[PDB]
Amino acid sequence: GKKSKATKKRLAKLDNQNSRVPAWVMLKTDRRNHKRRHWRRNDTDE
């Protein structure tokens, strides 16, 4: 498919939201990314 530039910025963003909860946020909060998404398993909008 041919993605537009906006579609891309979004796909981009979605990709970053897909990272882990930084190691330090764990210690800082004295101890889960509920928005983790697999390319195959899950499905993005658009």
Partner 1 sequence: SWDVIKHPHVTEKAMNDMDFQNKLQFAVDDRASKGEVADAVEEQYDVTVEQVNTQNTMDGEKKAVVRLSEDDDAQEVASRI
Partner 2 sequence: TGAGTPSQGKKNTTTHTKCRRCGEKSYHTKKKVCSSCGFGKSAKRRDYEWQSKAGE
- 3-class DSSP assignment, residue 41: coil
Rounded least distance, CB 37 to partner 1, Å:
15
- Contact footprint for Na ion (CB under 5 A): 43
Cβ atoms of 1 and 20 closer than 8 Å: no
**By CB under 8 A, is residue 11 in contact with partner 1?**
yes
What's the half-sphere exposure (Cβ side, CA atoms, 13 Å) at 38? 3
Contact letters for RNA, residues 4-43 (x by CB under 7 A): xxxxxxxxxxxxxxxxxxx-xx-------xxxxxxxxxxx
Smallest distance, Å, CB 38 to RNA? Answer: 5
Q: Give me 13's structure tokens.
A: 């963003």
